[PDB]
Amino acid sequence: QDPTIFEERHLKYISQLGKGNFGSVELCRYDPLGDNTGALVAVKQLQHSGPDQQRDFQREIQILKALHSDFIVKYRGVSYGPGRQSLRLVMEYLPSGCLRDFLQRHRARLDASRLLLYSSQICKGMEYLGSRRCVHRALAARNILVESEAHVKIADFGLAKLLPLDKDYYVVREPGQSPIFWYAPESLSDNIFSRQSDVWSFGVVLYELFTYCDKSCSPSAEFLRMMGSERDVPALSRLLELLEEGQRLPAPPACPAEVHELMKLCWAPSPQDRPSFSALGPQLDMLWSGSR
Numbered sequence: 001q002d003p004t005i006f007e008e009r010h011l012k013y014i015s016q017l018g019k020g021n022f023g024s025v026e027l028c029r030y031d032p033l034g035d036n037t038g039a040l041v042a043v044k045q046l047q048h049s050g051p052d053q054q055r056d057f058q059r060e061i062q063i064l065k066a067l068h069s070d071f072i073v074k075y076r077g078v079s080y081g082p083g084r085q086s087l088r089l090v091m092e093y094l095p096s097g098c099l100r101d102f103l104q105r106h107r108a109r110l111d112a113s114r115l116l117l118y119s120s121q122i123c124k125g126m127e128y129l130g131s132r133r134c135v136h137r138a139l140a141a142r143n144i145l146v147e148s149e150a151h152v153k154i155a156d157f158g159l160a161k162l163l164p165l166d167k168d169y170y171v172v173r174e175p176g177q178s179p180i181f182w183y184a185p186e187s188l189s190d191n192i193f194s195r196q197s198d199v200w201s202f203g204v205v206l207y208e209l210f211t212y213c214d215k216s217c218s219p220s221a222e223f224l225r226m227m228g229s230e231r232d233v234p235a236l237s238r239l240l241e242l243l244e245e246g247q248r249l250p251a252p253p254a255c256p257a258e259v260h261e262l263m264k265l266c267w268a269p270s271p272q273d274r275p276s277f278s279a280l281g282p283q284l285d286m287l288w289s290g291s292r
């Protein structure tokens with residue numbers, strides 16, 4: 001039978017890789033021989049899951065299984081067993097971890113060339129998603145994995161959703177918890193998501209890259225600075241005002257002028273004024289290839 005069914009009894013828990021409110025990703029060994037020689041895999045499972053979370057998890061599985069890109073984390077299979085909440089998503093395990101941590105650890109040896117390479121790879125992964133009409137909704141350096149020092153892959157499809165065939169956006173109900181500083185203003189204000197709201201998020205990823213995810217100039221830190229001595233204004237309320245005024249994150253010192261221009265375009269107020277990933281990719285490819 002298919003290599004995509006992993007027997008539950010053979011999955012041996014090792015450690016946690018990620019957690020959210022409704023699920024976790026765990027490092028596990030798939031060990032059918034029982035001698036601790038099996039492959040390592042990353043396994044997602046739900047906790048505190050109601051029907052809605054279970055239904056979304058089914059969606060996540062079917063999306064990831066259908067993606068075949070060098071820049072998207074690889075689906076391996078599922079597992080299940082008796083009773084409920086036992087459905088698991090098995091993926092490849094990337095021991096180098098996430099790009100956010102990699103940039104903070106290795107900042108001093110990673111030049112603008114390499115950051116341009118990462119940006120171009122992430123953009124290609126998002127172009128691939130765009131062609132399949134998938135809105136990722138969690139594009140952030142913490143969800144990008146390092147396959148090797150010159151190869152990254154997009155992960156965390158827990159919020160990903162397909163566009164309908166007849167509409168280029170979708171709307172959610174006022175959900176659980178969003179990373180407000182990565183989200184498009186229409187997403188924040190009206191729960192509208194699209195490929196173009198992902199582009200806005202990509203701009204914030206470029207900002208992360210070219211600050212090396214430094215905590216002192218994180219988006220949240222920059223927001224707090226953009227706050228005058230008013231500390232008790234709800235962040236979301238104030239962010240939305242700042243964005244409406246045309247305020248945006250500053251150009252990082254490591255950031256070439258061309259990349260800053262691309263960030264600014266990713267953050268166009270109107271989603272239809274934002275470039276597609278297919279337009280951004282050649283620009284970043286030119287900049288990467290040119291700095292080699």
Ligand SMILES: N#C/C=C/c1cccc(-c2nc3cnc4[nH]ccc4c3n2C2CCCCC2)c1
Pocket residue numbers: 017018019025042073091092093094095097098100101141142143144145155156
């Ligand atoms: N900021 C920050 C920190 C992020 C962080 C820290 C430790 C581990 C990981 C991690 N390693 C992974 C290795 N193979 C994997 N396969 C699929 C997801 C996956 C891995 N994840 C995460 C990636 C996002 C979703 C949750 C697990 C991310």
Ligand SMILES: NC(=O)Nc1ccccc1
Pocket residue numbers: 181203204219220222223226242247248249267
């Ligand atoms: N896209 C963008 O510029 N967002 C932003 C602006 C100010 C503070 C934090 C985030």
